[PDB]
Symmetry: D2
Subunit: 375 residues, 4 copies
Amino acid sequence: MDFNLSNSQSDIYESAYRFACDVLDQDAQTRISQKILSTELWKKAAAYGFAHGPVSHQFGGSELGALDTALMIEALGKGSRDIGLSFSLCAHLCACVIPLYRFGSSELKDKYLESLVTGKLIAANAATEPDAGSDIYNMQATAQPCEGGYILNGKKIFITNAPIADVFIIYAKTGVSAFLIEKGTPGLNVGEVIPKDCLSNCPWSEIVFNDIFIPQSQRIGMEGAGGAIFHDSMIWEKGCLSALFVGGLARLLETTLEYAKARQQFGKAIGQFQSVSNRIIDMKLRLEQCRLMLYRACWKHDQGQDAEADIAMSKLLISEYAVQSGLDAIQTFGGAAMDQELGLVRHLLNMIPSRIFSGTNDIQKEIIARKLGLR
Amino acid sequence: MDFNLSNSQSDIYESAYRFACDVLDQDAQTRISQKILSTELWKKAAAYGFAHGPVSHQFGGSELGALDTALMIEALGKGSRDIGLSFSLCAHLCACVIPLYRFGSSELKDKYLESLVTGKLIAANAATEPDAGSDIYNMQATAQPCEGGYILNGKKIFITNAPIADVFIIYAKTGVSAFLIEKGTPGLNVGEVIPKDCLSNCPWSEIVFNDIFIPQSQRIGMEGAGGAIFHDSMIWEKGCLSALFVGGLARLLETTLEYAKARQQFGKAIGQFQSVSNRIIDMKLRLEQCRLMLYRACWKHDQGQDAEADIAMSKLLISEYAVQSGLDAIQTFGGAAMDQELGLVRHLLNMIPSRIFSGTNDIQKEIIARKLGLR
Amino acid sequence: MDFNLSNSQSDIYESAYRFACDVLDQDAQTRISQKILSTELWKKAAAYGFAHGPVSHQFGGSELGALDTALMIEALGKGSRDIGLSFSLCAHLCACVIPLYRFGSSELKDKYLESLVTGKLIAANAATEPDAGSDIYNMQATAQPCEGGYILNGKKIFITNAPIADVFIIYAKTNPDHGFLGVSAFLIEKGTPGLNVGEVIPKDCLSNCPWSEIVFNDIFIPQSQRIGMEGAGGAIFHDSMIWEKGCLSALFVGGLARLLETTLEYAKARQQFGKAIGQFQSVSNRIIDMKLRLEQCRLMLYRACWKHDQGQDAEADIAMSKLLISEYAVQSGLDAIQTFGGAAMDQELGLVRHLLNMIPSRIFSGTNDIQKEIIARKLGLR
Amino acid sequence: MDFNLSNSQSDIYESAYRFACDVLDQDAQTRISQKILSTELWKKAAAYGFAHGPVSHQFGGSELGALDTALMIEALGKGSRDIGLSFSLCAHLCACVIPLYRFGSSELKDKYLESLVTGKLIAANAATEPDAGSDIYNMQATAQPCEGGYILNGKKIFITNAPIADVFIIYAKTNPDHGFLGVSAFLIEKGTPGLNVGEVIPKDCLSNCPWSEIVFNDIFIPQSQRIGMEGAGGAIFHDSMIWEKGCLSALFVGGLARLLETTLEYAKARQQFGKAIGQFQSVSNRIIDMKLRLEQCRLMLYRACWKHDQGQDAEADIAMSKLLISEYAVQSGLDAIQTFGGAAMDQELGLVRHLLNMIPSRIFSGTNDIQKEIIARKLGLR
């Protein structure tokens, strides 16, 4: 039992935090106010290492483990206010890079992987539909077999990164299968953006497949395998977003601490008033607890143990605590909280899709209950 | 002790609810998506009675009491999704109409009151500044006396309804005093809008006073009286917004109930799953409790009793419950909650300024503690 | 809409509070220490009116409505620390007096009701068994019909007032078929052959309130001692619990009122750091929570009671009241321990025992899940 | 970062859990019913190692670190229902053995420490008074210096283990001036003239754990029986409480682990509506909460203990651990009563008494407000 970062882990965390502070956060205020997703900074961040995860050195990755990745994304969440860019990165990593690295052929990997890992190509994820967003077994997207490939038809909505994406990872009925599709392929129609607020500057839209021919080699994994591949994605997504929010929570705490040590009222800093002080103590309690839960899930995974219930516990706890502390912060700032430059109300806006992405909290409760022997 | 609406009160509630349903809510979806504040519907609503409050028949009011007004605004909050319009109305009523009716001269009243009450003139409220939003005794807005009037100078920010306003109620240092100022008067410069999300389509901006001459008769009440007048405003505001959110909470419950009785999963309506069912039971518990607290505060006032602590309790409870239930609803809808057409995420957006308008929750706690003998 | 007590209600409340303060509370300290249930004070309180409820004047009652009764029991909960005596009274009233008045024949009522209402006879309730405490439809208690009556056999456990009871209201099987119509209600006198009342097992959650188990070994029940018609027991029982739910809620509302006043006093006086500790936002926030809880659930309870007095269906409102009051009483008791610190385990101060006695609120006429189910059903969720 | 027990820690935990299960828990049921504190079992457990902590082998200890000790006491809290015996042991270890080992002279340690560590002598702690329980700087206890020693006078109340104690660690005034330096610590033998130990007053919150009040009437303290230097008492006391905070937290972490396993079993078996009631989302949500709480505060406690073992400053981490564990234990005990229903007040099942015994966690080494103040100060908020 040891509760310090190894020197390697501190190095990973501190380098990533410097990058997020000095490169991404510099003009984050402006890009955010103007709802700009900077592909320039996005690619700088991807090439720095935020798109690597566990991908091996052979494809330009750093062969990081789960705890290592979580530490990078935690630094990212703490150091950069541009959380929409951070979310785009995490999605590209978990929904495309990691599935391709773990389940794709050597041909698919040699053609696409290193470009995704090093940020030459941006990727988007598409498995959610009106009735098929949750139940990703009943889906109105179908890829019928044909000579030397497939014919894909359907409509995927809420596609993170599609307005900027070069490739798309599509899940389609065949069993479900996973396909990589290049932007521009005939019959692939990317649609325009509907205004966003919850992680505002992170682009999303809907894509339409109208008799798209998918080459045989662009299938990821075996036929019918999509459901497992996708499942793997969500685990990683669950972890990375958990890391991101732990980082944001850390940022939120330091900010609130500043506002409390400086703001003078009644002849003393308002942090001596037990209302604000109690909210800060709550933030600190929440952050330390769910930080430890997250590290233990990641570390168990890196040990080869099965970490899926631990990560479910992590996502549950961080979802809840992040929302509650965001409320506490709005209460603590008062009439200075709606400062778009302070970016707190938008912080909570961006934290809204936490229970709206890789499982509501009821799904996590089901995972935990099953692990406990309750069904 | 009696817990039924009198026939008169039911009539007030049901007529207002029909108006909000049939007139205001009809195309609310569209105006909201397009961030449109319809001055047409605004004036229809004002003339219907939503701008009357306690103003006497002599000025076109209906001589309503506090409980009557709360019932109108509750129906309004339940029947119309266009909550930004509802907020504009409440502000016009509480920050301008009611102060003018209760503290203005017969000259000021005869010139302005009936036009405000019947909705021929829209009014905005201005007492909040960077360091003077909270402490409305230390303010960087000053009205120095001069022959036959005053010279006003300053800058008021976050002025609800200023982009659409015909008159402004200004609080200025002299003691503080209250002045009515017509739009366009020389040296009055209304500024353009900064984008909004928390009650989005409700217009706000900042105004600049540069050597404005205020006629003597445009002062409201006595010199130095501003602080009392303003205080009265906030009480009424506290009540009306409380009513509005109780109404929205009622709407939110019925909607969630629908989604739960219809949504079929695992062979049964998802309302038989104790997670969603427990959230609905919570909503119902919250709504009934804070509804009763609100009616009792209003009724105590109508009895001539001092209701200020009761209304503080009401605002506290409704602020908290509205936020919590909005969270519960996001959790209950899941991936259908970010439906801009369903308007739930925007509902919570509009509910954010509840602890950001007529007191944070700490101010209410102070009122209650003082009433209890604790300082 | 009106939030004032009528003068009649105000008198009912103030008179009952004076009685609780001046008669029941006076030596409550000692009786509580020595685990004494005073049958003397029990009978005085019952004859004063706490055993009357809705019973008409012709049987010695005061024809109180539900709201009136709730105001009486609220006064009792606020004015007297002897909460076990209060609970014993509430049980006699809700589980015995009221079923008999509402469902018993004129013969049965003429024989027993005035004695119960005036406190000459104490009554106990018996419908709970190891597996039959909850489902009082699946019951290991049987009263088979026979010539001129019934033969009863079984074992009822956790019987409030059984060691002191003169009569028992028993629920028993009479039509072992299905349907919600196989249990009936009988009144049985103490001492009747085959009835063996047991000795007391140590108690802490309402310590001084006596309870034990009774066993029926071929007891003959005369025909005239059945309460209501055959099979009606299930309805009878249901009604009992509703009245019980309301009265206990009133009692706890009263205790919360008491707890708030005490906590307010201790906060205005106790000086630490040079000022009354109620200026420390921790203690004051705990008091503000107590006040918010008290007012909210007080109004929920009054409205449920008032609805019943209107003839409206009050079952979901009463469920909401019980739910809220259970939760708030537990929470405020915790907050009170937190505010007192090391003076809270003061046996004479009686706070830890106060929360102990508040424990069986979710352990008598439904856990909180039952209330949630009543509400969910009333909402259309099943 | 590593989240596995080393083999040594795993052995320490498993051995202690076996001892708690097989020796202390075996007849815990009966001893609890009859309010018996077994000095026999107390001495066996102390000699096994529960009285050792960090004491070196030369005094009969095992040279455990804070994390090791916390794992032992966690095993004790999980494996033995006799929580009062556990609390008596923790008090002897944290309030007596550890101050003496850390601050006592070689003469004092040579005379007393091995006897305390091996359980030949039971020790009790005395620093609490009516107004001096909290501020153990403002104290109505005085030990004025004199020829070859001190003269002690005063009255200490709420003394854990005083009825059974052979020695007492006393905190007393010696420099009535200001400064945080006017109290000193003394070891005093049972029977010394002027020491009057009192009889037991009935208890429920850790019922079978003996406590009483002691009065000093011109007791002569030999000079060599002062612990540490003069005025050092305030530091000594502070250190005691830190160790106490950690150990009690461990104990409650252990109880929570026990409560979870029991609740899991009762949920996998109890069939209602044709299925195990753990499939009902109310009971399962309560269990999931228990699991979340247990894991979070378990990790907070281990990390505080580990930090201390590193030489880092652990005071705020230990405050956070105590805060979280107090709250979670109360909440989970409530959830457990809610899940059991009418079987929770089962005296042999011991849940209601479990929560009763969990009550003095915020009633011993700080309410929760003290922990919040430690954390706020460490955060820079004063």
